[PDB]
Design a binder for this molecule. Structure first.
Ligand SMILES: CC(=O)N[C@H]1[C@H](O[C@@H]2[C@@H](O)[C@@H](O)O[C@H](CO)[C@@H]2O)O[C@H](CO)[C@@H](O[C@@H]2O[C@H](CO)[C@H](O)[C@H](O)[C@H]2O)[C@@H]1O[C@@H]1O[C@@H](C)[C@@H](O)[C@@H](O)[C@@H]1O
Ligand SMILES: CC(=O)N[C@H]1[C@H](O[C@@H]2[C@@H](O)[C@@H](O)O[C@H](CO)[C@@H]2O)O[C@H](CO)[C@@H](O[C@@H]2O[C@H](CO)[C@H](O)[C@H](O)[C@H]2O)[C@@H]1O[C@@H]1O[C@@H](C)[C@@H](O)[C@@H](O)[C@@H]1O
Ligand SMILES: CC(=O)N[C@H]1[C@H](O[C@@H]2[C@@H](O)[C@@H](O)O[C@H](CO)[C@@H]2O)O[C@H](CO)[C@@H](O[C@@H]2O[C@H](CO)[C@H](O)[C@H](O)[C@H]2O)[C@@H]1O[C@@H]1O[C@@H](C)[C@@H](O)[C@@H](O)[C@@H]1O
Ligand SMILES: CC(=O)N[C@@H]1[C@@H](O[C@@H]2O[C@@H](C)[C@@H](O)[C@@H](O)[C@@H]2O)[C@H](O)[C@@H](CO)O[C@H]1O
Ligand SMILES: CC(=O)N[C@@H]1[C@@H](O[C@@H]2O[C@@H](C)[C@@H](O)[C@@H](O)[C@@H]2O)[C@H](O)[C@@H](CO)O[C@H]1O
Ligand SMILES: CC(=O)N[C@@H]1[C@@H](O[C@@H]2O[C@@H](C)[C@@H](O)[C@@H](O)[C@@H]2O)[C@H](O)[C@@H](CO)O[C@H]1O
Lengths: 89, 89, 89
């Protein structure tokens, strides 16, 4: 089966659901008005996510894994950028 | 192995743990006084969860996947109801 | 592929990422200053996590699964201790 991860924030709420399907992770978004496909699109067979608010601004971290390699993807208001995470050392 | 997803809220806390085991997802609940099996029981091989508070009221979203189909299940105070989520379009 | 779970707290933030790799779960930690391997090291093929604050103190629950057995691991300020969780009854 496909594998998913979810996060949410605020009281609307906003929800983001990430799905790993055939080696690709995609993103589905709710901001109160309907579901839409988000900008996130990166390789992975497994996904997890966390997020936090700084005031009203959301910050999201998606951890995408293929084989033994886990890559962190960061949203901080300006598109998806690679994070400093590594699995060891 | 079985696959799990967890969420929690407040300072007690309350915890909910969802487990996909042989194509079925079940729910275990802590509200401070012991673990009990919850009402949630729906098909799935994979599960993720998120939740949020509106005042003191909890809202939970469980994303259950089998094959390429992901179904959203909603708790909003009145049992489990199907959500509008779809994976694409 | 390896399987991960993530949680975070506060506005720094602190992040914890748990990874199940070849039957072992390990922990990676960010507290604002770099990634380091945490103390958590327990068996599992699948992992999920949740956490909550009581004032400034973090409490973490990691759910580690092998076969049909799910064990809860608790951080409450004093190392990792076994929790009361069981999957049924
Ligand atoms: C890629 C990275 O490590 N990002 C860091 C960020 O580093 C920047 C450098 O990559 C370079 O671009 O120069 C700038 C300016 O000096 C930074 O040093 O440093 C941030 C501050 O310590 C890290 O924290 C987040 O920064 C976000 C903006 O990028 C945003 O402000 C957020 O609120 C901050 O927490 C940032 O690290 C990334 O985020 C943290 C939470 C971890 O996930 C880490 O692994 C990420 O790389
Ligand atoms: C099934 C669904 O889409 N639920 C919506 C809800 O729709 C209702 C209709 O299904 C029908 O029953 O008529 C009523 C009254 O007009 C609604 O339109 O609409 C809600 C408001 O926009 C959605 O938001 C949540 O509603 C909950 C009560 O059902 C509760 O109040 C919660 O706080 C609201 O966020 C609701 O959407 C569902 O929840 C959101 C967060 C997503 O998960 C979405 O996919 C769910 O379907
Ligand atoms: C192992 C366990 O069940 N821990 C409980 C804790 O039980 C203690 C006993 O194991 C023994 O050591 O004697 C002491 C003193 O009487 C306790 O009874 O009882 C706590 C209070 O109800 C539970 O709640 C958490 O306790 C943490 C400290 O251990 C911390 O204060 C936290 O804020 C409390 O929520 C504790 O249960 C564990 O945590 C909860 C949230 C669940 O995850 C549960 O399955 C865990 O076992
Ligand atoms: C902050 C926010 O919600 N921005 C929306 C845009 O991005 C979507 O949400 C962010 C958080 C991240 O999940 C993106 O990958 C995702 O596409 C969105 O593109 C825009 C148009 O629909 O709406 C913004 O509000
Ligand atoms: C709000 C709440 O905790 N309700 C409890 C009842 O439902 C349990 O919790 C909700 C949030 C959801 O997880 C359910 O599937 C779950 O069964 C519960 O049945 C009742 C009796 O034990 O206790 C309520 O407080
Ligand atoms: C509360 C805290 O951050 N403690 C740090 C120590 O433990 C690390 O974090 C806790 C929450 C848990 O994740 C541990 O398994 C993890 O090792 C850490 O060992 C110490 C030295 O780096 O720094 C503390 O602040």
């Amino acid at each position: 089966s496909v594998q998913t991860a979810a996060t949410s924030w605020g009281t609307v709420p906003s929800i983001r659901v990430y799905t790993a399907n055939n080696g690709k992770i995609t993103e589905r978004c709710w901001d109160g008005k309907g579901w839409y496909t988000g900008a996130f699109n990166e390789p992975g067979d497994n996904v997890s996510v966390t997020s936090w608010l700084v005031g009203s601004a959301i910050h999201i971290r998606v951890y995408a894994s293929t084989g033994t390699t886990t890559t962190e993807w960061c949203w901080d208001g300006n598109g998806w950028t690679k994070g400093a995470y590594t699995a060891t050392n």
